[PDB]
């Protein structure tokens, strides 16, 4: 009741499904942070390695080497 149950993960994700390709480049990711939440604005250099290691750790992000360039989506089984 502190805080809500979000991870980095359900909000990557979210961010993910939100968009109609259902996939994203890591700078679109940080851009959606960004326009999401103030205080992302604000400071930058903990979030974004967050961020990247749940890209990278999590199974159920999958990096896809797009010709127009990498993109990551989501891949659950
Ligand atoms: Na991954």
Redesign the pocket.
């Known amino acids: 009741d502190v805080r809500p149950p979000f991870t980095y993960a359900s909000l990557i994700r979210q961010a993910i499904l939100e968009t109609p390709d259902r996939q994203l480049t890591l700078n679109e990711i940080y851009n959606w942070f960004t326009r999401m939440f103030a205080y992302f604005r604000r400071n930058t250099a903990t979030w974004k390695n967050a961020v990247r290691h749940n890209?990278?750790?999590?199974?159920?992000?999958?990096?896809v080497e797009n010709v127009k360039g990498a993109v990551w989506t989501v891949d659950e089984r």
């Open positions: 890209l990278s750790l999590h199974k159920c992000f999958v990096r």
